[PDB]
Amino acid sequence: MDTVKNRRTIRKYQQKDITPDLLNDLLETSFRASTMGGMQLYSVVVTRDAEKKEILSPAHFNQPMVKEAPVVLTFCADFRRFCKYCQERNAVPGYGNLMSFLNAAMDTLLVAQTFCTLAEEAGLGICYLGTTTYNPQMIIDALHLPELVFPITTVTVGYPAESPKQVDRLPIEGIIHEESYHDYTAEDINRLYAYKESLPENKLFIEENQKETLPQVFTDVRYTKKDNEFMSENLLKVLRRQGFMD
Amino acid sequence: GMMDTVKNRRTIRKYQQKDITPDLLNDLLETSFRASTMGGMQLYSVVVTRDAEKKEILSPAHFNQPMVKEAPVVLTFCADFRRFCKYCQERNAVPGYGNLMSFLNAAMDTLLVAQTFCTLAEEAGLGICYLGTTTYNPQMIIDALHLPELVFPITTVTVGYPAESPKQVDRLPIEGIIHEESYHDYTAEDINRLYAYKESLPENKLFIEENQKETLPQVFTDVRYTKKDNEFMSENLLKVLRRQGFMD
Numbered sequence A: 001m002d003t004v005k006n007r008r009t010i011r012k013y014q015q016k017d018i019t020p021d022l023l024n025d026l027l028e029t030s031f032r033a034s035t036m037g038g039m040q041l042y043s044v045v046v047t048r049d050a051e052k053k054e055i056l057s058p059a060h061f062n063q064p065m066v067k068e069a070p071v072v073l074t075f076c077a078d079f080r081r082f083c084k085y086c087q088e089r090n091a092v093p094g095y096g097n098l099m100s101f102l103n104a105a106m107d108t109l110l111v112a113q114t115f116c117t118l119a120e121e122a123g124l125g126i127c128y129l130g131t132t133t134y135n136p137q138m139i140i141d142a143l144h145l146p147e148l149v150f151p152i153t154t155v156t157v158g159y160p161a162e163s164p165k166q167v168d169r170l171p172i173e174g175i176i177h178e179e180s181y182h183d184y185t186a187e188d189i190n191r192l193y194a195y196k197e198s199l200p201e202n203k204l205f206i207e208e209n210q211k212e213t214l215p216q217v218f219t220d221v222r223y224t225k226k227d228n229e230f231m232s233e234n235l236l237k238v239l240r241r242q243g244f245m246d
Numbered sequence B: 001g002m003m004d005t006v007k008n009r010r011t012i013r014k015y016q017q018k019d020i021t022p023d024l025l026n027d028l029l030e031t032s033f034r035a036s037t038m039g040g041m042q043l044y045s046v047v048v049t050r051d052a053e054k055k056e057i058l059s060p061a062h063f064n065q066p067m068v069k070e071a072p073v074v075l076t077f078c079a080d081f082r083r084f085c086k087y088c089q090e091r092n093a094v095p096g097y098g099n100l101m102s103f104l105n106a107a108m109d110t111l112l113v114a115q116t117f118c119t120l121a122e123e124a125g126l127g128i129c130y131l132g133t134t135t136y137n138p139q140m141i142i143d144a145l146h147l148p149e150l151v152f153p154i155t156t157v158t159v160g161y162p163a164e165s166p167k168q169v170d171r172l173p174i175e176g177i178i179h180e181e182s183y184h185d186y187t188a189e190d191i192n193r194l195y196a197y198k199e200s201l202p203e204n205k206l207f208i209e210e211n212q213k214e215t216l217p218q219v220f221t222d223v224r225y226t227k228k229d230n231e232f233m234s235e236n237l238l239k240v241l242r243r244q245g246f247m248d
């Protein structure tokens, strides 16, 4: 609770390695997270080797965390293992479909976040890389992920070599809805985002992108319609490649 | 303490007749919202259901699993790009988030919160249970909670003070989940070795017997999560994502 209240994403890491015992203890416990049908529809590829990080780094747009973190974890949706189990038990699996993908993805994210929460409680810094679903084929290729296996997210982990100011969050009245969804009026939006907009960090972000409003940075530079649409089609292509759709 | 709590965690489906105060629920949620979020955008909303008739309305969506009516609190974690797009519309920005990629990005944001919450809730002495039925009946949840365009229900968690002390369920040996550097594909020997313990457990033998099957996976493939249902649901998902504007 104190750890979560005070958490922040860490992108700069010490030279200190994460012992296999610590890492496996964290992972093993993270595997205690809820799982559809007790099935554990995930795999975690652990990348420690410098040469291997070198190869994954372009998949993640060369974010320095990949090469600088002692450990890089690729959390993967995985129905392959369960299907192999089915195949060894005279069972016909029907999990090469989007619903199963989503099911496995949820299982995977639950594990990833439990890991992150436990890693942080242990004094480690973590960073999710969203680039995982931008370049899934590069990750599939790098990590030799076979059919019914799909990388969902990637976390970089190490002992913190920075202590950044915590980023803002919206007032909870903007996120929580009592009994039904209460749509946002312009007045709601202006109230909810007033504080975010007052922060020098966000004002700089607007100015250094030559925008007038904070949302324009997100729409025009960070997460554009063009890219989102390209990535949506790519996602379908890579989902089909991995057997999660026809 | 969170690690020992997680090590010993188990899903709780029976709850004490004891309410979760707003102070506690809101504190847990506010803290859960500190979970990592793409671009710091917070692409989720949480519908909090406490009313009895609201629970009765949600119940069928969740196949009338008892926890919906029995828990003092039912939380529907929703992927939400709507709030951000409304913000865009008020700041002269043209959003392009009515697509699958953006839906998946919001979903992830949402699942991170949900699980941060569940972990915090369990640390606070509560018991939780996820309902997987959320993605079987998203339209019904959409209608029930009045989730508009760019809002999609991802998962639902029933929360309460525990009124059961169930045996912990098993997990696979970690060597069956963790792969060093690259994915190490499973041989029949690997499979047999990994699942041996699971298959030896009386619950699982009972699960097979009471389902008229010969092996554990058959219960899953033939009864619980069937090919036919999975395909139907896959199609249903595309339909509902379309209806909610996360694809054309």
Ligand SMILES: Cc1cc2nc3c(=O)[nH]c(=O)nc-3n(C[C@H](O)[C@H](O)[C@H](O)COP(=O)(O)O)c2cc1C
Pocket: A032, A033, A034, A035, A036, A037, A038, A039, A103, A106, A107, A110, B009, B010, B011, B012, B013, B065, B129, B130, B131, B132, B133, B168, B169
């Ligand atoms: C995506 C997801 C969906 C779930 N759906 C249900 C469900 O609808 N009904 C239920 O009783 N439990 C559900 N659960 C709980 C699991 O059955 C449970 O996590 C699994 O049996 C392992 O049990 P444990 O959490 O006690 O270790 C779900 C869990 C996940 C992550």
Ligand SMILES: Cc1cc2nc3c(=O)[nH]c(=O)nc-3n(C[C@H](O)[C@H](O)[C@H](O)COP(=O)(O)O)c2cc1C
Pocket: A007, A008, A009, A011, A063, A127, A128, A129, A130, A131, A153, A166, A167, B034, B035, B036, B037, B038, B039, B040, B041, B108, B109, B112
């Ligand atoms: C799934 C998702 C994808 C993310 N992708 C990246 C990314 O690739 N690069 C990065 O530096 N941070 C990434 N993050 C971290 C967020 O940018 C970060 O959580 C946000 O700035 C809020 O900061 P905080 O975690 O310190 O509160 C991602 C977070 C989420 C959950």
